[model samples]
Target: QDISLSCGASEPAVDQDKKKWEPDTKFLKTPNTVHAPATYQDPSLLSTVPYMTSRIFTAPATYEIPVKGDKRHMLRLHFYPSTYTGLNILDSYFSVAANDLTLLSNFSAAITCQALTQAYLVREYSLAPSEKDVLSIIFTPSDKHPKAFAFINGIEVIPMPELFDTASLVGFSDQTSDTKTANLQTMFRLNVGGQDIPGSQDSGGLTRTWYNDAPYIFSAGLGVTLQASNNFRIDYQKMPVSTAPADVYKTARSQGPNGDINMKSNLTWMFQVDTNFTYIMRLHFCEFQLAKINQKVFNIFINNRTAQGDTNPADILGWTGGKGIPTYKDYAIYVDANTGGGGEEISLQMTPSTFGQPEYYDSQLNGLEIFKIDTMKNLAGPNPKPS
Candidate 1:
């Protein structure tokens, strides 16, 4: 069904309607300089008698790790649900607490859990503050009392770089125009600013800004993917690390009248699917229904050009355009699951033009947005040599 929007004649040159802006951008102040960097939370208390050997239980009881491997390896833990045949899906709780019982006053451990089977997946141990630390895991039954069928099979430690620091590599903007690198320094891009972009009294069109609009090249780039190990073939990226996980956009809030795309809603984004790997994007988002009245229309685009009307959940958009997608809203038509090629680029994008062009009253340029890089994988693994 197509939604119709009725606007009054007194609409100014720039619409002052604040409904279309994204939630994160709402009430955003100029970047705060006085705030300190994020720090790890205080450590918890520790126990000298780490494990109870005699009992076979989960929850409150902790499993004793016999030895600690060198810092150069990624530890792999396996869980066997029924013992004989491997449990395809299982969850295990892992934590690295300080080894010393008395010094537990100063140091603690960071606890994290993983859902896995009998496969090989690598997880880094956030080691405690001592030389030789204890890595404990508790495999409790998900249900009521306790089931006897679950036991942790074993663990594998792989060599890795000792200390991990994200700030050393990625940091805050050094005065707005320094330079930025691609993920792990694989690809390179350049950003040019410092100019008043041409603006005019125009209606019904998407305008590119100087300092704050979508990057003309950001719509074309590399992606991130999970590398599998032995036995375990799980897709961890599918599970969102955000509080309210949505399919396409992480945080989407709708204003009154479902079809008002011209409002201040700015969670829309584009995807740059590298041709080296295939992409299968699924959007799990929310839709708004304006009371018994105001309803708005929506539209989507692909490759900075193609546009579509009316999109719903349960739809899987594939990457097919091969080279690059500009704007793709109709997932069913634009996305290609098995997009395969080499040295090529692809892009997908979306916008809220279903109702009409935006009215930008009481606004400078517009709200700032970023294109999120979802998932990327090398189809042929490592590059090959001639036989």
Candidate 2:
């Protein structure tokens, strides 16, 4: 479930009676400045009233979110620099800090929001709570801009399964000496086994659009068979409720269980990304078949690195005597600094484990999410460099 707070709302508002929005408190002080756009408007952009206005905060302002002390959560910041009563918040310069971790430093609202070009900016980050179970998001003025201020339209905190956080690049920092990058920003989040995911109105806290991975794979000269299941009972406990949506589990692409095949050439998806940055790859899976524990086993490879070995989703579910529970595995890889700049291809391949029985030799995936860490130390500035 999602815990969303509509900043600057006097009374809580519900969207379609499904998404609940509460008054912003316990995280921010009494609204010092709240605004609504008066000039440009787009139904598709800043679609909601809450998203049009913001609880404008000056420098050195802090917002605290109450969450589990040791767990990881997905923090989404929504921003729209729309003309608020004729005053545009374009020059706002600030840095965002989660506890002591600096997420964005010397950030400009106009540059960050892609003002005049993009309607709004929604940044997603993997965040962890502090010792007191509160994640403090502090906005301090960057010394670079003296007159700039900080503001936010909406804030969302969604509980993520601990499994996703166990080996993540959530709070990684950039290292200049070694030219190491950190502070990852989501680039691609896909429902590999399913179709397009709509806006936040129906997709829970994170308004992430999970696109189908079929075209990307097929266009790259690789093909796989798509399989789906509908009668299986879903077990939400296996993964975050929002992580593996119903549509994702309903379909999956797999390497057929036929003759001995060359996994390397048959089952792989290649993506071109900016070189010199580390990327996080998450693979979602569930054993749709009512097979035995070891009936299906495979290994994951990303650009020749072993992500998961001897993986069996059915075995994981059998631990709890569950049938249709979904699970996900995460991996992080750094592209060599020597690699060419743009169009650097990163290939992700799945091959059946030779250790498993011949009958279990097949690889499958339900969904995939890839994110390129911004590191905030590049020529392109804070915005993701277009591919």
Question: Which candidate number maximizes TM-score?
Answer: 2
Q: Candidate 1: where is the Cα deviation over 4 Å?
A: 1-273, 289-294, 305-307, 310-346, 353-387
Q: Per-residue error at 264 for model 1, in Å?
A: 12
TM-score of 1: 0.23
In candidate 2, what are the lDDT values of residues 1-387, reduced to their tens digit? 666887666677765435667766656843454434435665556256457557665547778777887656777777776666645466677777776666666666566445325677776776533446777777776677656677777788776544344343322332112112234556567777567766552244555667788655722334454555556566767345767576676567777656266344447777756566677787777666645666556666667655665443223334434456777766676665443234365677776676546455677777888766545433123434322
CA lDDT, candidate 2, residue 1: 61
Could you tell me how far off, in angstroms, the CA of residue 300 lies in candidate 1 after the best superposition?
1.5
Quote the lDDT for 153 in model 2: 73
lDDT of 1 by residue, 1-387 (tens): 100011111111221221121111111122321111112111221110111001122333333433344432223332222212222222322222213211011100111111221122212222322234343433333343123222322332222233222111111121121111111111111111112222121111111122212343242321111111233221213332221111112112222233343334432333332333322222222221111111223333333333333342111112211111111211221223333123233333443443333321110111112221112311112212212
Ten contiguous residues with the weakest lDDT in model 1:
45-54
For candidate 1, give the lDDT.
0.23
Question: Model 2: which ten-residue window has the lowest total lDDT?
Answer: 170-179
